[PDB]
Structures are given as C-alpha cells and as structure tokens.
C-alpha cells in the first residue's frame, strides 16, 4: 500500500483513437519528412 | 411480488437446513456481498 499510493492513480488510456488505419504508402509518405 | 419479509422468511427457512460446512460457505459469500454493498452505499450516502 505504501508503494501503491506512491505510484498513485493508474492512468486511463482509451482504445478508441484518431488513428485511421492508414495505408503503408501513405503512412510512409507522411513520416518521410525530415 | 413477494415482499422483503417473505424473502427473509424463505432465506431463514432455507438456511436452517444447511450443514456447518455449507453454512460456513454461505456466510462467507453473504459477508463478501454485504461488504461490497455497504461500502458502495457508504461512499454514496454517508461519506463527507
């Protein structure tokens, strides 16, 4: 319990996200900058 | 629909027939359920 309150509230992370299932071609072109 | 007194009467009559081992398991399960219910009600209604 001493280590538990030190860690505190475990963060919630929603599985529903803005990530769009993009094509490999498009994800590559997007991430190709710099 | 059966009123709570009817249910409590049935619970008592049914419980009277159990043996020590089954009564021990029934009481443990009832205590766990009661603890959960009382904790939630206290949080909602009694906690400052």
């Amino acid at each position: 319990m001493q280590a538990l309150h030190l860690l505190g509230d475990k963060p919630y992370l929603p599985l529903s996200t803005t990530w769009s299932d993009p094509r490999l071609d498009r994800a590559a072109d997007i991430t190709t900058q710099n | 629909t059966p009123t709570y007194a009817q249910w409590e009467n049935a619970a008592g009559v049914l419980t009277a027939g159990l043996n020590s081992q089954q009564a021990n398991t029934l009481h443990a399960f009832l205590d766990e359920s009661r603890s959960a219910a009382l904790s939630t009600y206290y949080i909602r209604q009694v906690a400052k």
């Binding site: - | 409590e8 619970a11 008592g12 009559v13 419980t15 009277a16 027939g17 043996n19 009564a23 009481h27």
Partner: protein, 48 residues
C-alpha cells in the same frame, strides 16, 4: 442458537410463546430452533 446471528436478531430466553407445529409456519425463533437442532419442522414437532 445465537451464532451465527440470523437477520441481526439475538435469541434469548423470554416469556413469549413459540409454536412447534410443523404447519404453523412459525416466526424466526422456530427457525433458530431448526438451525440449532439441524432438523426440519416435522421432525421438530416429532421431537417435541
């Protein structure tokens, strides 16, 4: 009789009258007797 407590009711000697008739469907005290003696209502009346 008293442990485990049945529906938060404490059993003790009193001047009230308890029915041992099997078909009478007695109060919680009859249930206490049945649980303590580990017998049903008909056998409770037979024991009486």
């Amino acid at each position: 009789f008293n442990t485990p407590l049945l529906n938060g009711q404490y059993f003790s000697t009193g001047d009230e009258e308890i029915d041992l008739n099997s078909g009478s469907t007695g109060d919680w005290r009859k249930t206490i007797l049945k649980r303590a003696f580990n017998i049903d209502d008909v056998s409770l009346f037979r024991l009486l």
